[model samples]
Target chain A: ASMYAKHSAQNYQPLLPGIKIKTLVYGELTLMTEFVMDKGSSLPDHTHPYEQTGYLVSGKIILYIEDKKQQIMAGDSWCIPKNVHHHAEILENSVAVEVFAPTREEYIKYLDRTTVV
Target chain B: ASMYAKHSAQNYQPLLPGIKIKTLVYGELTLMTEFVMDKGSSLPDHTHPYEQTGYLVSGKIILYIEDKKQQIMAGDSWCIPKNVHHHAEILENSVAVEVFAPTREEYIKYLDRTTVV
Candidate 1:
């Protein structure tokens, strides 16, 4: 099959009551995803071994990386090192594009099975 | 330095007369980039060993991926398989987010140097 895909065809998975995700592609060493979150939603604190790079496609967010906090809007971006405690709170309906390296096996299965909304 | 960034501070690098790119983050296995293009710009033909996944943040584009022609707009996306020979042309002023795996060496230098219009 062709590796190309469109966002409309990919159903949104409700990760939480106010959060949704649509994984765009699964690569050998990385995975690309689009995260959709509603205002006031919180991702909470979490740590990941996979390195992450992302850009805010739209809306507003408050990112907490370690002890740092940044209020971000559309077009903002970040590069998160591996295993760093990080989280964010959404201030508006948002769409963010993020890439993770080493294709975390768990997330690889995420874009494959879960398609709930 | 912190592995975090805000695109507003990153100057856009002119890849072509009509194309500009602002690389947001550099990971060990991949690179995340924000592409800004003026209408009618062509990326021309190119090939690479890295796998790429991307999302259109705004505007229009015509993507040529191994003979498959896709016309994409805001929110549209593509996953170009590794070294499949792909290129694209802009149909409107545009911004797109792209991720490439295995951290293309030359492109690494691109984000660091070559700051010209």
Candidate 2:
């Protein structure tokens, strides 16, 4: 578990204000992250190689997946296949938990350089 | 999304003070939930049939899975495969987000009776 803890913090970007992320575990089969978004902040549309799924812990947000748009509030969740383009914006102060399958190796680059804010 | 929302709320128990749970999404393949536990509280030794994975959003916790005990603080995460016995104790006021694969059908039974409080 010490290795897990060290790897996560060493790998991900420093979560910024209005958008903070804490990486908890990164393994061969899974990746988990804790995310907090301030009111009106957003993660613009993006895509990744791994299958993605997660839950909203509190607050509200709009989820844009592919061409679909869904409003997600606390207790809401969604599943997205690998490489599907998606983005999210906080409708209110919000916190969410996300998991990724087939670990995101690219994220390691950011950690190696310690370029995360 | 209305159906999704209704189904979740209808299937889960009302969160108790210091122990709140909100169901966000329920489908054939996945289940997502939001959890908040006050300091020193715990979801004692227990296990379910589905694969379990989640992240600690804020606060701290100690996760017991099988014989391994891991301390999890905010930004920490863990994964447990289906039916692996586990329990959690809140080390501090905490919030977390969790997801299950091969959905937790038994949870619906509690919802049907609305016995959760």
Candidate 3:
């Protein structure tokens, strides 16, 4: 019944007071999580060592990957291979789901070492 | 930048020994997250109040929704409406990403009330 009880690890910081994450599946080669972000929030810029892919469910977002930028809305999807710099800013109240490979070890370590405000 | 600094909220548990979650995009109406699970781990059966949809990035899974059951492999996907009774079991080490609509409020509340191991 509890989201944490449904998964293996948490590597994230508290950004928006109303945001939440639910782990749907976790394994050695893949990971799936559902994230809920508040309106008008921005995720800033970042990258990872794993190939990342995802789709938008509702609302809108401006995604910046490397030197390319695209505005994605509901029904639009994309993928970013390992180590490619990328980030997004929520254009409207929205929801999106993503999948990652080879595990997010760096994120897990970050979560373990950070504090929530 | 750190992953947490890129997003908002941490409402999850420390489940697997090697799994991790990364928030790709989060907004009021939509949320997206990436999960990594260990090999041979099963996610068991579960459902939510939000219309859920997602895709498989790698590995495999056995999904049970209502009376129908299907084995989902890489590139396979499905959707479950809000309140649908569905769940899954990892057949071989796997990963999947899911999206929830109108926010996962119940999950956030549960995360706020529980303690991690």
Query: Cα lDDT of all candidates, in order?
Result: 0.76, 0.63, 0.53
Chain B superposition TM-score per model:
0.87, 0.75, 0.68
Q: Give the DockQ of candidate 3.
A: 0.04
Worst 10 residues of 2 chain B by lDDT: B108-117
lDDT of 3 by residue, B24-90 (tens): 4433443444455556565555666665556665677777777777777764555566676786666
- Candidate 3 per-residue lDDT over residues A1-117, each given as its tens digit: 111112223543354554555444433444554455667777767766766656665678877877777777764555566677887777787766565554455433322222110
User: Docking quality tier of candidate 2?
Assistant: incorrect
Candidate with the larger lDDT of 2 and 3 = 2
**Higher-ranked by TM-score: 1 or 3:** 1
Question: Which pairs in model 1 have colliding backbones?
Answer: none
lDDT of 2: 0.63
Off by over 4 Å in 1: A109-117, B109-117
Total clashing pairs for each candidate = 0, 1, 24
Point out where model 3 deviates above 4 Å. Answer: A1-19, A105-117, B1-117
Candidate maximizing DockQ: 1
TM-score of chain B of 2: 0.75
